[PDB]
Amino acid sequence: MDLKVVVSLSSRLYTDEIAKMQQRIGCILPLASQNVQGLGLGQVYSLETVPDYVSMYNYLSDCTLAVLDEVSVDSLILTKIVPGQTYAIKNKYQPFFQWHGTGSLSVMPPVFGREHATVKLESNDVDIVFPMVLPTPIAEEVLQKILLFNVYSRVVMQAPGNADMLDVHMHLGSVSYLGHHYELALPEVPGPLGLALLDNLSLYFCIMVTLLPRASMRLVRGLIRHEHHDLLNLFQEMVPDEIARIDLDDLSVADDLSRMRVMMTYLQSLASLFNLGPRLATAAYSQETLTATCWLR
């Protein structure tokens, strides 16, 4: 088995950028199959396009990732990602994330700003931006946040008396972490592929809203009329009118089984939609030297 895939440049890499490519050693880069362009994320995320973070998500998920370990002039060595090998990955990204959780790892587009993952290359007509590496809970939280932002910023733009544009950019806003809050990069238009993702998500939503187990309605009504739980704080002691008007019928068990059957199958389908982008299973991330043995799941 081979992992060593060498990529030549085409012109003399200047000595001002060999220092920062020495600084970016052990990071991850997306492949194309060699050539120089597309070996990175500049070809689908440029300055011209509004960053949708979904077409570049399509490119990074659809293509096998690659580790960049050695940079020389006119030649730099890459290493592919093939399942069954436990790659050594160093967390070398300026929005810092300690892997104290030691969970599964995730790759994402550079949603933390263009500057943090870019590198200029004045040798050839190619520029390289880098994919972001970040743990599973932050990645899925930022994923649902960027989808909720690109679906609600547009409807806030649809408001004629849009008195509060800055409401969602400071409430949604930053990312949830105990160490700090790290502000991200926000598009204004969702792009085509983002609305395709929200289209399939809303399709799953309207299919699953046709079947609700009616016993659970009674449980949340009873718990609202019990003590207000800390998990129940989002209701602030209120029964919504909709759950009051879909409980006109009684409690059954015959429809409940097939309801739950189609709910299991459609939640597994939704999980297959949201397990998108390539994933890493981690064994024993070493803390003192910032390296992690990980294999492709």
Binding site: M157, A159, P160, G161, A163, M165, T210, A254, D255, S258
Partner: protein
């Protein structure tokens, strides 16, 4: 025939009754050129002015009528106005629509022009969308009729067909002035108080130009413009026939979104309906030098008189020739709330 079954099931919260429409492609060409929009319902009253709640309307363009007599877009007008029993109609009654894709252009429509045309026309289960079931079987030519539109003297096509008891109680409805009157005289009232502010600012000052914006001007400016030639400042008040495209109210609605400016432009003496309510930026890294370049290009427009409104409560007038006359903006917050409710949400 999609947007009617779209908005029919949608607006059941804030509207009892829903009327469906066509809009030709010639009647809104003077509203927004180049097909830039692709809505919001707020029907104000004739003598019961006040303020009312807003309702969203959905629509589509580029999809053709079954009538080949004209080929245009799709809209629809909600009706929710009549208190309690809906059998009464309010006569001489505007219903405003805000057709948009990103709030440019307005649509003023009457209840007479709507309803006179309407009368002139006439192991569990999934539940079906009930109201779409009767539109496919109609498919006829008599459902659509031609209505002389009152705001713009053109044809506006309605669609209605004998659906059910909501549209069945519509065609029996009749009942026993000032809905286009109030907004125009309200514009002339705020224009007269702003022109009075300019009058008293020119009075308390020496009646002199401070020339806030720098331009070079020729020595024959007192010749090619005659002495005290403020005939454009004279007939400024008749020329402002529009207001919510005009920048004057645009600063008041911009209070909800500090160093911003909106500019109206009226020509030197009747070159045409020039423009209303353009934008001077300070936010992006084009910067204050780009604002200054756009501002001096505004000031060197030798055949257009510009009116400048600020967000913080100040008004400015720009004479062509770089002369600026300061002024106040301070209006009673009742009209402010009336304006921001007329556009949108407080």
């Amino acid at each position: 025939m999609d947007v009617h079954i779209d908005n029919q099931v949608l607006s059941g919260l804030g509207t009892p009754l829903l009327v469906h429409l066509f809009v030709p492609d010639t009647v809104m060409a003077e509203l927004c050129p180049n097909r830039v929009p692709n809505a919001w319902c707020q029907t104000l009253f004739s003598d019961r002015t006040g303020l009312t709640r807003v309702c969203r309307v959905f629509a589509a363009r580029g999809m053709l009528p079954g009538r080949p007599s004209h080929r245009g877009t799709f809209t629809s007008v909600p009706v929710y106005c009549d208190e309690g029993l809906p059998e009464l109609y309010n006569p001489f009654h505007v219903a405003a629509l805000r057709f948009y894709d990103e709030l440019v252009g307005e649509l003023q429509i009457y209840y007479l022009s709507l309803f006179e045309g309407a009368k002139r026309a006439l192991l569990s289960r999934v539940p079906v969308s009930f109201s779409k079931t009767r539109r496919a079987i109609r498919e006829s030519r008599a459902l659509v009729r031609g209505i002389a539109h009152i705001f713009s003297p053109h044809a506006l096509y309605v669609v209605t067909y004998p659906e059910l008891s909501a549209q069945g109680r519509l065609h029996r409805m009749t009942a026993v002035l000032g809905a286009p009157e109030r907004e125009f005289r309200f514009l002339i009232s705020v224009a007269l108080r702003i022109s009075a502010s300019f009058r008293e600012k020119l009075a308390m000052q020496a009646w002199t130009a401070q020339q806030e914006i720098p331009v070079v001007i020729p020595t024959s400016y007192s010749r090619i413009y005659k002495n005290s030639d403020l005939i454009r400042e004279a007939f400024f008040t008749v020329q402002t026939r529009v207001s919510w495209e005009s920048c004057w109210v645009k600063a008041t609605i911009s209070n909800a979104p500090d160093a911003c400016l909106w500019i109206d432009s009226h020509p030197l003496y009747e070159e045409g309906a020039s423009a209303w309510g353009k934008v001077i930026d300070s936010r992006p890294p084009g910067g204050l030098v780009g604002a200054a370049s756009q501002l001096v290009a505004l000031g060197t427009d030798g055949h257009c008189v510009h009116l400048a409104t600020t967000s913080d409560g100040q008004a400015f007038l720009v004479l062509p020739g770089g002369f600026v006359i300061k002024g106040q903006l301070a209006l009673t917050p009742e009209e402010r709330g009336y304006i921001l409710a007329r556009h949108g949400i407080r």
